[PDB]
Design a protein around this nucleic acid. Structure first.
Lengths: 125, 125
DNA sequence: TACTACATATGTAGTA
DNA sequence: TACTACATATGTAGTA
């Protein structure tokens, strides 16, 4: 038995990379994340170490280098995070959140329609 | 000039109450929040104090009691939080998040249709 | 790669 | 109501 599966806000950047590349080396994660923000190799490795310790990822040695892989279902931890978020910011109501989106004009009719599409597509049995 | 407007995860419970009741007393916030979880008067007041200090709320004295009110646009801070969330968990793609919802079966066709509705309703000019 | 360091934050709550 | 206390966490990063 265990508890709360945790992913600090800054940790998602590491996990999204681990989930996206299935099996990766710290160095890899490090270069990938730098491709879009100023972060030190050490900092990222701390995140890596921390995830590894919370057991959200596992590893094995390949050459003499460590390669990491997810030890948690992505769809599940993101979904749990999202409900938390939705409850706190909208009393868990996708409507209330999709409506706050249109309102603040964070969506152009092109995206509004693509959505309405896919979404109409889901209702379709 | 100033910076980052902050609302710790536990703070939203206080703000949602301040935004919902327009002008409130700490005591009020305290009873309201207890109506759904075990939290001490002091704890909640700390949140209140902290928000007040970050200037996300202001106050005036009424009888000799303090009444607080929002000093920030709700639609704006929630929206900023949501983009942050969406970028981190879905590379900012409402589709990708609405699809993760249906998938994990966090939505019954009733809600799926209400959504598709309102949403189809938004595309409607 | 493994530990350690560390200012700031966070969730809880106690003293003045 | 105002401060203080405090374990744990968090984002950054340095030493072994």
């Amino acid at each position: 038995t265990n508890k709360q599966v945790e992913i600090s806000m800054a940790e998602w950047d590491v996990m999204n990379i681990i989930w996206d590349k299935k099996s990766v080396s710290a160095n890899e994660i490090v270069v990938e994340i730098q491709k879009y923000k100023e972060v030190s190799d050490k900092t990222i490795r701390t995140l890596i170490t921390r995830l590894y310790k919370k057991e959200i990822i596992k590893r094995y040695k390949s050459e003499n280098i460590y390669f990491y892989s997810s030890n948690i279902k992505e769809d599940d931890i993101k979904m749990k995070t999202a409900k938390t978020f939705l409850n706190k910011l909208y009393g868990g109501d996708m409507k209330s959140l999709v409506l706050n989106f249109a309102k603040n004009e964070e969506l152009n009719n092109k995206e509004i329609e693509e959505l309405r599409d896919i979404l109409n597509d889901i209702s379709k049995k």
